[PDB]
């Protein structure tokens, strides 16, 4: 009414990750918080770093609750991702408006019939350049891929000049092909 909390669709993990000369699946990678309403969401995000802020080597990440942040999860392993690249003037400009957009575009189940295809996202900060990435659960879902990369790109304000890639984990893992491109 004026008192209770407005749900999300899903339940959310969001998930903080730091390389090292350590265990690094399991010492570097810690829960943040798991919420599920959009108050949740505001208090958790306003209580940390802007991406931007991070040291290189740093990500944070965003899967729903029951998927494991790695793409050999059952719910990854036959995934990919929409994948941004962002140069140092874009860490200034772009970064952390794309990635916060992307946290909304999650939260909000913005992909119509195909939200729940998407697993969760990644923000890479890396000296060689930034990354985001919206993460798919079948790259074979052509409807539901392309659907995804279509609405994500508009969400961003991308124009027809740019065009971004999606890439499947495996292929990826190997060393890479954009199976779709939007």
Request: proline residues 3%; charged residues 25%; neutral net charge.
């Amino acid at each position: 009414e004026h008192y209770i909390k407005h749900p999300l669709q899903n339940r959310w993990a969001l998930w903080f990750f730091k390389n090292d000369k350590s265990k690094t699946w399991q010492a570097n990678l810690r829960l943040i918080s798991k919420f599920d309403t959009v108050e949740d969401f505001w208090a958790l995000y306003n209580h940390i770093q802007l991406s931007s802020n991070l040291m290189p080597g740093c990500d944070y990440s965003l899967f729903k609750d029951g998927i494991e942040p790695m793409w050999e999860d059952a719910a990854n392993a036959r995934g990919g991702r929409w994948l941004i690249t962002l140069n140092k003037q874009q860490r200034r400009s772009d970064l952390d408006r794309f990635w916060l957009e992307t946290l909304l575009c999650l939260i909000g189940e913005s992909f119509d019939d195909y939200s729940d295809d998407v697993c969760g996202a990644v923000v890479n900060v890396r000296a060689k350049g930034d990354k985001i990435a919206i993460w798919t659960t079948e790259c074979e879902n052509r409807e539901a891929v392309t659907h995804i990369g279509r609405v994500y790109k508009e969400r961003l304000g991308l124009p027809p000049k740019i065009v971004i890639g999606y890439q499947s984990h495996a292929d990826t893992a190997t060393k890479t092909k954009n199976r779709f491109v939007v």
